């Protein structure tokens, strides 16, 4: 996260770290959506241009974390993966269209002060909240700059951007399965996701019921925090039918 701040303890209890077994290192962010299911970006697991194709046994999920590098004894919980499901129409060839994946845990994780699931949006909450100017929150342990790394989980609040402005900021083809967020050059403030924040959540706090909803998944950006560029996020509600199909079939 570029130009963010240290998270407060328990501020993002759905935050998940995807951890590589060997070598031991951060792979991506992710989020907890139930006691057995974790949501992430497809490109965290499958990205052929970079020779990335992880299998279940390659990875661990670490839940309840705050410190990036420490083993947080008595606080974090580490889970093995039963199965990975990647969207069948994930487009890694062009623009990361439908950049979404689910991971089922081998055993249910116990909830605690530090571990708790985020809500997924219904059509109505999505329609109400996914509006230009409305701010969401992005969290992760990714790099602090495009070109170092944080001691603890970072957080940044960013405004959703008008679709034509998103489109005009890039030569990449944008789809309805994405939205973009970030400050414009003339707005003074800044901030973005960066390398390592991939797969983490873009959340919004509903003013209707005071619950946090995951509206997006950290997906892609041309660099990190560049003037005139924006971060692009997987549109979670647009892909919710697939999410539900997977959970209903394999749950």
């Amino acid at each position: 996260i570029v130009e963010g701040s240290d998270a407060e303890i328990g501020m993002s209890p759905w935050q998940v770290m995807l951890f590589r077994k060997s070598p031991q290192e951060l792979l991506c962010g992710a989020s907890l959506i139930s006691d057995r299911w974790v949501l992430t970006a497809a490109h965290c697991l499958l990205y052929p241009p970079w020779d990335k194709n992880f299998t279940e046994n390659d990875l661990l999920v670490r839940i309840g974390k705050h410190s990036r590098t420490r083993y947080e004894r008595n606080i974090e919980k580490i889970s093995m993966l039963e199965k990975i499901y990647i969207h069948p129409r994930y487009n890694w060839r062009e623009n990361l269209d439908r950049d979404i994946a689910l991971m089922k845990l081998k055993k249910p994780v116990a909830f605690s002060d530090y571990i708790h699931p985020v809500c997924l949006p219904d059509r109505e909450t999505a329609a109400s909240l996914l509006q230009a100017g409305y701010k969401g929150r992005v969290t992760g342990w990714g790099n602090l700059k495009e070109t170092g790394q944080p001691s603890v989980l970072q957080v940044v609040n960013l405004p959703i951007v008008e679709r034509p402005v998103c489109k005009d900021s890039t030569r990449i083809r944008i789809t309805d399965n994405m939205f973009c967020a970030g400050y414009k050059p003339d707005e003074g403030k800044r901030g973005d996701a960066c390398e390592g924040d991939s797969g983490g959540p873009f959340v919004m706090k509903s003013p209707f019921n005071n619950r946090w909803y995951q509206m997006g998944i950290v997906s892609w950006g041309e660099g990190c925090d560049r003037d005139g560029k924006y971060g692009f996020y997987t549109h979670v509600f647009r892909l919710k039918k697939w999410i539900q199909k997977v959970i209903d079939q394999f749950g």
Binding site: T69, Y71, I78
Partner: peptide, 11 residues
């Protein structure tokens, strides 16, 4: 840079 995690999670 990462602190070693308990072995049982690697088995």
């Amino acid at each position: 840079d990462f602190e070693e995690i308990p072995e049982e999670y690697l088995q």
